From a paper:
Since deletion of the carboxyl terminus of Lsm1 generally enhances binding affinity, we therefore crystallized the Lsm1Δ56C–7 variant of the Lsm1–7 complex bound to the U-tract RNAs UUUUUA and AUUUUG and determined their structures to resolutions of 1.8 and 2.1 Å, respectively. In the structure of Lsm1Δ56C–7 bound to AUUUUG, all nucleotides are visible within the electron density map. The path of the RNA around the interior of the Lsm1–7 torus is a right-handed helix, with the phosphodiester backbone in the center and the nucleobases splayed out into binding pockets. The six nucleotides of the RNA make an almost complete turn with the last nucleotides 6 Å below the first. The 5′ adenosine interacts with the noncanonical binding pocket on Lsm5 by stacking on Tyr39. The 3′ G also interacts with Lsm5 by forming a hydrogen bond to Asn66 in a manner that is similar to the interaction observed for the terminal adenine of UUUUUA, except the asparagine side chain donates a hydrogen bond to the guanine oxygen instead of an adenine nitrogen. The structures explain why oligonucleotides harboring these sequences bind with nearly identical affinities to Lsm1Δ56C–7. In the crystal structures, the 5′ end of the RNA hexamer is nearest the “proximal face” of Lsm1–7 while the 3′ end is nearest the “distal face”, the same orientation as in the Sm ring where the bound RNA passes completely through the center of the torus. Lsm1–7 binds tightly to the sequence AUUUUR, and this sequence is highly reminiscent of sequences found in 3′-UTR regions that undergo adenine/uridine-rich element (ARE) mRNA decay.
Numbering used by the authors:
A (entry chain F): 3 to 73
B (entry chain A): 15 to 83
C (entry chain G): 24 to 108
D (entry chain D): 1 to 82
E (entry chain C): 8 to 57, 68 to 92
F (entry chain B): 1 to 93
G (entry chain E): 5 to 79
RNA sequence: AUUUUG
């Protein structure tokens, strides 16, 4: 499964998550599940271009995810 | 369930803001509704006007609420 | 499917997607999930403000249409914009 | 009598479909399924603002795009009687 | 090992929740399920409007999971 | 069905349902099903003048999917038993 | 012509993805799954309202919003 | 992955 192989090859690395709203999250991908729910370590949140938040750990509900991109 | 409202006059508020007033005839497990003798009531502040509309089948996902009258 | 897509095989059809995008194209293939293959596709572009059509089109060639986002399918032959009946 | 049973019983008769974005489709119900997917014949498509109109010989409507359906009261009577 | 564990380990903790409609919650997580429905106790809500923020307080608040964007455990 | 049971325990108590369309309805919870559809009785609409069409409504049904929040007054027994139940599900399921 | 076979024939080549919103992606198709979530590499992302473009080395695109998949990439 | 967990 191509999506699963990509995810397994970026787990533990730093990724860009874009949500359908366009809000961005940069962080270390801990794990994901079948709904594309995500767990991120060391997370920076970006609205438009500005960093708005940081989280040591963040749960992202998978229905919001537009894409997961290697950094 | 909605069986308690069957054959009663109800107002149905839809997600797009419409107010339908009619007799609830039936429903199913999606809360799809079937209404008879329905009017659509158009509000501007506290004033309203009615439009006769007949029978509706309302898709459940668009139903915000159903109120007994 | 209640729609027998083979009746449109090699005819131009109009497709509308959830969100408002509209295209036309010549039906070359489909599956049971209503994914389509359309050829000579043209997209009717919309105004960013009103969401209404502008009259401008763009060509897109051979396109795979996702059945999950299809909301409307209609043959082009017999269609016409008309005045308020 | 369930909503979708009424819908199946409306096959062959006029129907009004309003989509979630306010477009309306007037025409004869050709077919329908349990998703509420519809096929209509002899269709008038009215755009949301009520501005532009179109005629379509037939069309397919995916069920999860529908806001509501309107049918003639006479249909409900004649279906109750049968 | 799975993302929902972050929520599991956050039980009885003050969590931060980001919700659709420009809403934010801060509150003690008392329960949740696989939809991310949850109940928060002693919860503050920040509603952002376009700039300006409205603050609200709830003794006990059920949140439907389909509005949830992000959950963050406490620091 | 954790929250279905929680809401069962709130039956005949007062709650306030905030809909995703921003309306808020206070009333007595009379019913809840597996989809978290709720029935309220003796309702009162917050900012009622803004929603004139609700003035003549006494009882109502609300589809679970349009609910944003249900909020109510706290009770310690409620809170600790709810947390206990969540932990019980997590040990079991 | 079966739609998904055409997509599979595009693996290794350029593919232009058009979302329901004013957003597009064009890049080399690495692969896809049963819901046509898509892995693209050496990708350009387009905001077709602002005209801003971004680059990505490799990404998994959620198939939920995809209206159109155009083999051969974008002109 | 076609209405109550997008």
């Amino acid at each position: 499964s191509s999506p699963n192989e990509f995810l397994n090859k970026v787990i533990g690395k730093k990724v860009l998550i874009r949500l359908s709203s366009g809000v961005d999250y940069k962080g270390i991908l801990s794990c994901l599940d079948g709904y594309m729910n995500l767990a991120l370590e060391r997370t920076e949140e970006y609205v438009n271009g500005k960093k708005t938040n940081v989280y040591g750990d963040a749960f992202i509900r998978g229905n919001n995810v537009l894409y997961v991109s290697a950094l | 369930s909605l069986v308690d409202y069957v054959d009663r006059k109800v107002i149905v508020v839809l997600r797009d803001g419409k107010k339908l007033i009619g007799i609830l005839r039936s429903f199913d497990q999606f809360a799809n509704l079937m209404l008879q003798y329905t009017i659509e009531r158009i509000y501007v502040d506290d004033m309203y006007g009615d439009i006769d509309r007949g029978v509706y089948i309302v898709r459940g996902e668009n139903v915000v609420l159903l109120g007994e009258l | 499917s209640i729609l027998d897509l083979s009746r449109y095989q090699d005819q131009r059809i109009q497709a509308t997607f959830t969100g408002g995008r509209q295209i036309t194209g010549i039906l070359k293939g489909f599956d049971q999930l209503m994914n389509l293959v359309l050829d000579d596709v043209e997209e009717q572009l919309r105004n960013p403000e009103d969401g209404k059509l502008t009259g401008a089109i763009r060509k897109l060639g051979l396109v795979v249409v996702r059945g999950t986002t299809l909301v409307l399918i209609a043959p082009m032959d017999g269609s016409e914009e008309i005045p308020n009946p | 009598m369930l909503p979708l049973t009424l819908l199946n019983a409306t096959q062959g008769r006029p129907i009004l479909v309003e989509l979630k974005n306010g477009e309306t489709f007037n025409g004869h119900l050709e077919n329908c399924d349990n998703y509420m997917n519809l096929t209509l014949r002899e269709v008038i498509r009215t755009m949301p603002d009520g501005d532009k109109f179109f005629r379509l010989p037939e069309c397919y409507i995916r069920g999860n795009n529908i806001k509501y359906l309107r049918i003639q009261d006479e249909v409900l009577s004649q279906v109750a009687k049968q | 090992a799975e993302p929902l564990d972050l929520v599991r380990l956050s039980l009885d903790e003050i969590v931060y929740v980001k919700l659709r409609g420009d809403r934010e919650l801060n509150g003690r997580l008392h329960a949740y399920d696989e939809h991310l429905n949850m109940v928060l106790g002693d919860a503050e809500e920040i509603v952002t409007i376009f700039l300006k923020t409205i603050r609200k307080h709830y003794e006990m608040l059920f949140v439907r999971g389909d509005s949830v964007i992000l959950i963050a455990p406490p620091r | 069905m954790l929250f279905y049971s929680f809401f069962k325990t709130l039956i005949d108590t007062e709650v306030t349902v905030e809909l995703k369309n921003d309306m808020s309805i206070r009333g007595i919870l009379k019913s809840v099903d597996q989809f978290l559809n709720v029935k309220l009785e003796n309702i009162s609409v917050v900012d009622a003048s803004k929603y004139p069409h609700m003035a003549a409504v006494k009882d109502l049904f609300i589809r679970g999917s349009v609910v944003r929040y249900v909020h109510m007054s706290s009770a310690y027994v409620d809170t600790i038993l709810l947390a206990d139940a969540c932990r019980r599900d997590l040990a079991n399921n | 012509i079966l739609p998904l076979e055409l997509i599979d024939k595009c693996i290794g080549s350029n593919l232009w993805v058009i979302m329901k919103s004013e957003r597009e992606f064009a890049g080399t198709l690495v692969g896809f799954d049963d819901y046509v979530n898509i892995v693209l590499k050496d990708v350009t992302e387009y905001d077709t309202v602002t005209g801003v473009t971004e680059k990505h080395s490799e990404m998994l695109l959620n198939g939920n919003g995809m209206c159109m998949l155009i083999p051969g990439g974008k002109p």
